[PDB]
Design an enzyme around this catalytic site. Sequence first.
Site, short mmCIF file in Angstrom:
data_model
loop_
_atom_site.label_atom_id
_atom_site.label_comp_id
_atom_site.label_asym_id
_atom_site.label_seq_id
_atom_site.Cartn_x
_atom_site.Cartn_y
_atom_site.Cartn_z
N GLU A 35 51.03 31.34 50.45
CA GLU A 35 49.89 31.41 49.59
C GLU A 35 49.13 29.88 49.64
OE1 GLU A 35 47.85 33.59 48.62
OE2 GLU A 35 49.27 35.57 48.55
N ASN A 46 36.47 33.11 48.59
CA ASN A 46 36.67 34.55 49.18
C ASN A 46 34.96 34.98 49.29
OD1 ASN A 46 39.27 34.85 49.13
ND2 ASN A 46 38.94 34.95 46.75
N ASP A 48 33.50 37.47 48.29
CA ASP A 48 32.94 38.35 47.20
C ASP A 48 32.32 37.21 46.17
OD1 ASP A 48 35.28 37.46 46.01
OD2 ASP A 48 35.68 39.35 45.17
N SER A 50 34.51 34.98 44.70
CA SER A 50 35.41 34.57 43.92
C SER A 50 36.19 33.62 44.46
CB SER A 50 36.43 35.67 43.48
OG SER A 50 36.86 36.06 44.65
N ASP A 52 40.46 31.40 44.82
CA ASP A 52 42.14 31.49 44.84
C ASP A 52 42.22 30.21 44.35
OD1 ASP A 52 41.77 34.31 45.46
OD2 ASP A 52 42.14 33.65 47.43
N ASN A 59 43.45 34.78 41.67
CA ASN A 59 42.00 35.05 41.82
C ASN A 59 41.09 35.00 40.42
OD1 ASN A 59 39.43 37.45 42.43
ND2 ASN A 59 40.14 35.69 44.13
#
EC number: 3.2.1.17
Length: 129
Positions: A35, A46, A48, A50, A52, A59
């Site tokens: 990750e 991301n 959309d 958002s 991480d 998120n």
Amino acid sequence: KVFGRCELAAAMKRHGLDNYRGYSLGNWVCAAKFESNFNTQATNRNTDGSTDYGILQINSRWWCNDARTPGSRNLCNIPCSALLSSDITASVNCAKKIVSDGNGMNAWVAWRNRCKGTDVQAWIRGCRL
């Protein structure tokens, strides 16, 4: 801060992640490896809108507030910047809520795709725990 494999394993264990919700430590370390590559400062935006955050790439749409993710829920009640700290406590307490959410560790796409069904014990091999 970039953690060492065994260093992270110990901190996570110390924070009660070994076998939390039935997931051995190897799982958590494997997930952090894929990750964020053990880097607390990792971030990824991301499509959309958002982002991480941190070692476990939590998120902003559901778990933390970054004030720039319309619709966001902040279920862990923490600003996302808190997840970038060298002290992994915040990331760990939020991860516990995520893994208890009903989908287990499948919530982490890298875990599902690169850790799930593999010999995760290898990630803690050689460590003095």
